[PDB]
Amino acid sequence: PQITLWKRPLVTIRIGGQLKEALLNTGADDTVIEELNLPGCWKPKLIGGIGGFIKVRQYDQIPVEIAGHKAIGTVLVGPTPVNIIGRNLLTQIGATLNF
């Protein structure tokens, strides 16, 4: 699709068998999802943003479907204000910025 930016670029994703809503985020290196159970093992990490740092659980090689497009990669789980799809997965679905 072509998505304009008058509204937040929110889309449906599937992760761990469950549907969620997430923000397509060119300003995020990584994909960060609200607290949930994910199958498999994780390792702790800290990530930063506009206000400081939070602690997350890093899961690797997680399948994520984003608006019907498949990705498999790193998903960070923790107390993010908004579910965000970052560049690590945006590149897998061939997403670009255009103007």
Ligand X SMILES: CCCC[C@@H](CN[C@@H](CCCC)C(=O)N[C@@H](CCC(N)=O)C(=O)N[C@@H](CCCNC(N)=[NH2+])C(N)=O)NC(=O)[C@@H](NC(=O)[C@@H](NC(C)=O)[C@@H](C)O)[C@@H](C)CC
If the CB atoms of residues 17 and 97 are measured against ligand X, the closer one turns out to be 97
If the CB atoms of residues 16 and 85 are measured against ligand X, the closer one turns out to be 85
Kindly state the smallest distance separating residue 98's Cβ from ligand X, in Å.
20
Between the alpha carbon of residue 54 and those of residues 38, 62, 75, 95, the distances in Å are 19, 21, 15, 27
Kindly state the smallest distance separating residue 46's Cβ from ligand X, in Å.
8
**Helix, strand, coil content of the chain in percent (nearest 5):** 5, 50, 45
- List residues binding ligand X (CB under 6 A): 25, 27-30, 32, 47-50, 80-82, 84, 86
If the CB atoms of residues 63 and 81 are measured against ligand X, the closer one turns out to be 81
If the CB atoms of residues 16 and 22 are measured against ligand X, the closer one turns out to be 22
Taking CB atoms, the residue at the shortest distance from ligand X is 49
Kindly state the smallest distance separating residue 87's Cβ from ligand X, in Å.
8
Smallest Cα–Cα separation from 19: which of 1, 33, 2, 3?
Answer: 33
Q: For residue 89, with 0-12 CB atoms within 10 Å meaning exposed, 13-18 middle and 19 or more buried, which class applies?
A: buried
